[PDB]
Design a protein around this ligand. Structure first.
Ligand SMILES: [Cl-]
Ligand SMILES: [Cl-]
Ligand SMILES: [Mg+2]
Lengths: 138, 146
């Protein structure tokens, strides 16, 4: 269903951020697409990630490496998501949101970030194909 | 497959070219409409993030922004590098580096343009298979910051 899809895509999005918040690398890894998830040259299922102000990370290794690092370097992170919009088309879903981030590596510093997350439908649930996050600059 | 990658590449190329040459009609046509999909779950609703901007949602917000950008940009060229395409079913994901060169109006009649400025930007573009070709669903661009 449409309503169901939107809801399940939302839950997948929440999980992704919750996994960061609790420093749960195993879950986080599980939430990202693998070509096996797809049942695998046109690089079907190949993932990427842009962290705020970063160049592009490609493939599970660079991507998961960066999250393992981030988590290993952060003592405290909370995401307060707003303006969340979901678009589901076929077996792909597009989520945009504002990431209002508070972190501590330590004094709490806030970031205003916007993200586009792309999800893919798999038997094991909606999986991340791409995360692109960027600063909102004045 | 081998063809999909090439067609997507072509659509991605056409998108940047339209902007370069300030072709609103082509740019408009390159962005998805829900009619392209045959239209809830906001099937085929587009979004756009320009460097440093918040999110623009829906064709109206997105196209308005392109008219404005074009109107306020005397000269722009993109030089894409490190383009990568990933096709899965009816969706394609393209990441790239936008090496952007722009310029404003000149101080006077003795010059063609104002000084030129470069930007290092990276993008994730999400395309969608339609009977009329690959159409943009999302463009998200961001500065690469030191
Ligand atoms: Cl699809
Ligand atoms: Cl820059
Ligand atoms: Mg060019």
């Amino acid at each position: 269903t449409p309503d169901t899809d939107v809801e399940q895509v939302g839950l997948a999005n929440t999980a992704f951020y919750e996994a960061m918040e609790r420093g749960d690398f195993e879950t986080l890894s599980s939430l990202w697409l693998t070509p096996a998830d797809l049942g695998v040259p046109a690089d079907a299922g190949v993932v990427s990630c842009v962290h705020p102000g970063w160049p592009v990370l490609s493939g599970r290794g660079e991507v998961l490496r960066s999250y393992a690092l981030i988590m290993a370097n952060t003592e405290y992170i909370q995401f307060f998501l707003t303006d969340v919009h979901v678009s589901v088309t076929g077996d792909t879903a597009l989520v945009t949101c504002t990431e209002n981030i508070l972190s501590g590596g330590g004094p709490l510093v806030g970031q205003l970030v916007v993200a586009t997350n792309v999800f893919r439908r798999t038997p094991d649930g909606w999986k991340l194909w791409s995360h692109h996050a960027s600063p909102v600059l004045a």
